[PDB]
Each structure stands twice: as C-alpha cells, then as structure tokens.
Amino acid sequence: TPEMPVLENRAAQGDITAPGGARRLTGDQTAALRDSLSDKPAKNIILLIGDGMGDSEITAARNYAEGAGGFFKGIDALPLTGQYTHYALNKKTGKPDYVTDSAASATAWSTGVKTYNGALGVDIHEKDHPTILEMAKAAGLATGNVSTAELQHATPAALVAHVTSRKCYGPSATSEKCPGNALEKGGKGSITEQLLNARADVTLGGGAKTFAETATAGEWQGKTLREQAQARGYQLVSDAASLNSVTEANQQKPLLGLFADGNMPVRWLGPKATYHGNIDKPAVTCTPNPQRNDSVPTLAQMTDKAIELLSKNEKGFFLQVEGASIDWQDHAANPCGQIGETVDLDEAVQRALEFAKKEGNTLVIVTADHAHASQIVAPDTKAPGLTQALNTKDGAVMVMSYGNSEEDSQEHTGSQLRIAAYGPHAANVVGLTDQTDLFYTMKAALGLK
C-alpha cells in the first residue's frame, strides 16, 4: 500500500458520447494529491527524457495507441505536473535564444546553468560545470546513463562530457572542432574519451562506431577507444543475451552496453509525411519494425536491468533513461516512428513507476528536453508542410502536420512543456519552472553536499 499513489486509471470512464462519459476523474483529488506530497529524502532518482516529447507528441501518441480517451499507464500516471521553460542563451550576447537544441537543454538540467546551443557541460564562457551524474558518483551513489540513441548523442553525453561543441564525438571530430578540448592539446578529450573517464556504473545505448577510434595521445594513445575501454576494466555487452547475463556493475567492472553502431532500432515504421499527404494518400496504420529484435534490449529492458544493477547500492542511485528517437522521428516527419518511440518510453516509465512505488524513496520525473514540430490538425487540412493521416485505436483518422521547415529536418520549437513527477520532492515540478530548476531539484532531493 505505497503511501504515495500512482494514478491507476485516468482513461475516459465510459461512453464518450454520454454526459460524463469522457471524464478521467472519478471523484475529488484533494486527498490523493495530499498523499502524493512528501519532503523526505529521495534515496534514488530516475529521470526519463523523451527527446522532443512536448505535449503535442504526448497527445498524438496517446490518440493513436490508446485512443483519445485512453491513458498511458506510465507517462500519464504521474500525479504531480507542471510546465517548464528550456530556452538557451546566445553565446555572444548572453541573451535568451528561444529555441534550444539538445545539448543546451541537457546541459541545463544536468548542471543547472543555461548555455549556448551545441554546448555540453560548459557555460557560455566555455567553463565546465559539474553534472548531476558526476556529483552523484562523487557522493557514493550508483550511476546509470541509458539511451536508445548513440551514447555520444547530446542527452546522455551531457552527463559525462564537457565540450564546446556536441559534434566532438571522438578524437578526430574533437581535434578538429573542439581544439581546446582535444586530448593531444591538453584538454580532457572527445565526448567518448570523457565518457570513459567519467566511468558511470551502467552505460547502455548505441554509438559503438566511435569506439573504433584511436586516442591521439594519452595513456592509451594508439589504442582503439574500445580497446581503451577493455583495458580500463569495463565490462562490455553487445546484445540482449550478453546484457542479461550481467550480475553486477561497479567501478571495478563498470558496464558499457553498445547495442548498435549508431542509434538503436526504432520500434515502428511508417511512410514519411508528405505535401498534402492527408488528402492525396491513404490513411496509415503503423507497422512493427521487423528488424528491431529479441536480441536487442528494449528501452524498458535496459531500464529494468539498470534498476536491478543500481539498486544494490545502499547509498542509492541516479539513473537517466532517454527515449531518444521520438526527436529523431519528429525531425524526419515520420508519425509512426515518432509515436512508436513515445510508446517505447511509456513502457520504460511504467518499469520506473513500478520500481518506485514499491521502493518508496524514489523520485521519478518524466519530461522532454524541448518541444518539437508535430501538430495534430483537422482531417481536411490543406497545409504547406508535410502531413499524414493515421488510423487510430479509436477507428478514426488523425492527421499530423510538420510545418516549420522546408529543409530536410523539421525543427524543435520553443514552447514550454510538461514535466511530471512522482515520489519525494515531486512538488518541485508543479507550476511554472525552468529546466535548470530540475538540476537543483534533483541535487537537493538526493541531498548532494
């Protein structure tokens, strides 16, 4: 009977065409919300990020996978909610830049300082700031960094690398685009070199491609980054079997799961949206990606396994899980890809809430780094961008529009967006907050001195 309740059912209660049939509430919530408030310490924190998962992305995925009156048992089940701002800074002027990229936003919640687009773990003066994961490890807590994206990708890379440009994946890119970060120039090195130095306990995702690179200097000069990883004691897994037979993860044998050369496989496939696609082409039903595999751990599986391995630390743990390709698919104007990745994240959120509700001292937060392009529009819409009609769980058509770029990729947008939480200190996400407040919220809930 976990004192702090997870919402069990906020689907429409009945017949949506009848008075009250679309209500998601069965009665007053004052007592349940009083019950969801505690300022006791967070022993653990699990932060899940849906990259580019603004309210529009949440709504479109729900409409399609669960119906308009449906309910995500993970994403929609956190009882304390608010909206936060994620604007970045113009590097030269220090004024706001209203639409952040992935790097500046992830720098914001992981360091508590606003920065310029493309920066990771540094401010507009290129000065390094400690990340919540670096700080959690320093305090003796176990640390996890999970993502379906390549690990050099901004979201999980911000927790372990401090570079002046997110493009500095390896020695090569670094020496070129982050000259002062390049190892052979006295800096701390490429994103992957600093990730190896950071040494979290559990690091799972894709991005094996960069590890085939060789250090230009340093103790492991000439050796490949994977060679360097093997040499520094890391426990390297590459598939679901090898990951599941892992029984422990610590500093002596930190875990590095490289499940793909680049990003991990998307869950669902569909045609890309097109000009007047909702008018000129048939409504679409998403299809399961045949190449996604029971040999590749799902986000939910990587989450569960990271939780099992991190919860053995009695001091506690900090874990960040990213459903990364929601952003990727929204950029590609591919509704099916995008929605399937939201559905993927919801399964990981359910594993987190199921663990937190039993454990009792776990603060779980679900949010996104920034908003995105996709909009849900009327079925008859004639829009200038890319559109597509989808057959939803309701047996009705929903049309999605991508209308903010004539270029190859659709763009991020600056709208404030949902952040939701459950457990100790979850009140700190309610109302209007800033993305940097989340750093302070996590740091304080863990009591990191």
Added chain:
Amino acid sequence: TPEMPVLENRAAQGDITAPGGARRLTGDQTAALRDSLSDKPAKNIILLIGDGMGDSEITAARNYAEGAGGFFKGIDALPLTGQYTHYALNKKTGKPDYVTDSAASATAWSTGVKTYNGALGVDIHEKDHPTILEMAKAAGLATGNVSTAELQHATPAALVAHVTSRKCYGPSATSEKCPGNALEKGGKGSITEQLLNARADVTLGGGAKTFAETATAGEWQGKTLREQAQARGYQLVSDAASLNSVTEANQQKPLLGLFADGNMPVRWLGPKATYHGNIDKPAVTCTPNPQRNDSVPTLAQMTDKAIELLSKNEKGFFLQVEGASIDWQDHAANPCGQIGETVDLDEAVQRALEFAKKEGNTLVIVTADHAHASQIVAPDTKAPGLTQALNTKDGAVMVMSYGNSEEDSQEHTGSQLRIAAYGPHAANVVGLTDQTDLFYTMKAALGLK
C-alpha cells in the same frame, strides 16, 4: 494571510548566464503545495479562458512581453497545474474528432458532455444539456459572462444558448442554418434570443450588431433584439463610463454591456506574418492600438466590475471571462495581436486572483478551449508557412511560425494544454484530465446538486 498562497514570483531569480540564475524556484515547494490544497466549498468560481491559448501561445507571449525568464503575474501564478484533453466527437460516428472548434470545447466544460464541432449546448444527438451558468442561477447564485469577443461567439454563447450550429447568431442566420431552433418554427430561438432568456446577472462584451435584428415571433415579434432587452428590464451600457455608473446587477435589473459592433478592439497592432518573413524582413516591435480607449472598458476592467456586482450575492457567483482575440489573431497569423491579447488576459487573471486570495473561498481556473497554430522557431528557420521576427523585452529576436494552412486562416491544433487553478478544489486540475472533468469539478466545488 489567507492560507492559500498565489505564487509571488516564478521569474528567473538572477543572471541567466550564471549557475542558478535561471532558476524560477528559491527552495522546496512541498509545504507551499500542501497549503494550496483545500476541499472546502467554493463559494464562487471564476473561469478565465484564453481562446486558442495553448502552452505555445503562453510561452511566446511571455518571451515577448516579459522576457524568457519573465513571469506573468496572473497566468503563471496559479500553483496547481495540469494538462487536459479537448477532443470533440464526429457527429455521425460518435468517435473522437481530434481537433475541436470553440463551440464543441466550450460545450464540453459548460455542460460536461462531449459534442460535435460547431454545436453549442447540445450533444451529438442535438439534445440540450443545462450549462454550469444555468445551474448556478437555478441554485440562487449570481452569474456573469464576459468576453472581448462578440457575445454571440461560441465561448460566451455556450453558457446561455443551445443551438445545433454556432453560426445561429440572430433570427436571420438561425432561420437559414438552424431551422429546428428558429423561433418562428417553434424552437428556442437564436443565440442572441436565448442569451436574452438566460438572463445572467452580468453579460459584458461585443456583438451589438445582431441586436439590430428583429424577432420573427413571440412576445417581441417585430421589435429589435435591443428593444427586447430594454422591454425585459435589462440595463444596457455601451462604453466605459456608462458601465462604471452601474451600481447593481441582479434578476430585476440584469446588466448587458455591448461595447462594439463585433469583437472589441485588440490591444496591440503589428503586421501579419509572411512567407520567409523572418529572412526577408526586419524584426517587428508591437505597438499599442490607437483604437483601444478610455471609452472602451478593458478585459481587466470588465472582470473587476463583474466581480463587484456579482459578489453582492451572499450565496455566491459563477463568472466566466474570455480573452477572445488570442484565437482570432493566431488564425490571422498576427503575432502582435495574438501576444497583446494574452497580455490582456493576464491582467484580468491578476484581478481575479487578487479578489480570490482576499475572499478565501473562490476557485479560479485559467485555461484555453483548444491549442493553436503558432510555434516559436529558430531565427534562421526557413519554413513553408508564415513567419515573423519580433524584438522581445530581452532585446533579442524571437521568430513565430504559422505553418498549418495554405488557406487564409491558420487552424486549431489538437495538443492537450495547460489548465491551472487556485483555491478550493483546485487539486482537480492537476495531472491529466479531460475538458469535461472541468464541468464536474465546477459543479462539485459549488456543491450544485
């Protein structure tokens, strides 16, 4: 100090380029939120609707008028927040229609039943359902209905009229489009005729034009609707000074303020966004509309006057206030008009919160009927639709994009959106809810049975 706190400040606390400077919080919110939870009765309710005011609209307006790290002392200050769904229904199938218009959404929170786009006060079978305003009046509470739109517009009209199409403004359009509701055919009459019957204690807004039409039947056949109101005991006012002179409003002497022929004047002027407007043109600075006026009451003034007149009822009151032109200007791809109307709504929200914190038993809710088109995008965006660069309070450029219609009007979008509240029973807007839950939340808070 009335135990329930209104947020005093959620702006960035310091230098946004420094660690912690972008924080909107100054410490833990658990105690603050516990103090914001009460399940005692709401003696009064003030519902403020920004038409089309989704999170994107709130953010764009805050970024322009208050700076990225600024704070809307009204809109951003409600402590309990959540996200609600506003889908309508397809009339024929009864399945969800993912993008509602203003009529079906206002019908949903005012009656508690989902309906089809364009319906007012009736369900998909065209059955009338009592509204929260009619129920309040039936229980002896005073009632107010305020809007900057013409009063026949969907948002205020849904509280007092039951017609099969929102276009049925007066006798002529009702005869043509809602034959079943036409007075000469045995129906309840046009929107304006039903509004005159509903007899709220205070009704203020635009829409004088339709009152020049004459009734086709009934006791006032052949007389204009304005002559009808006069003969029925209404006190008619048409400007700021006549409204100010009003001393009481009740069933014997109900107040009807008609301040414009159509919609009331927008607060700010600016050019319409254009194709590649952010590449091809210089940035826009909004400017006050000369056509505003000390002779035209502002939304904040109409809100205050309504509060003063309705609070003389010892049993309590229900008041809806609509900032209407946010929607009109978002459809017109006019950033300045759109933002100025959000600033306008923020002032009315402040008046409502100021009253509520002092009174202690008033539930204030602030939300929108549906989301809209506008998106905040990167300055160098090259988009297919209409865009505009704007000079914000920060001394930086923000670019807005309207990209969902090649047609003249930009359109509504289906994303769930913010709903926020303050006062008794405010917990009921937190987490995921449906727009129809708002009807039940209001009914229960006032203890209407």
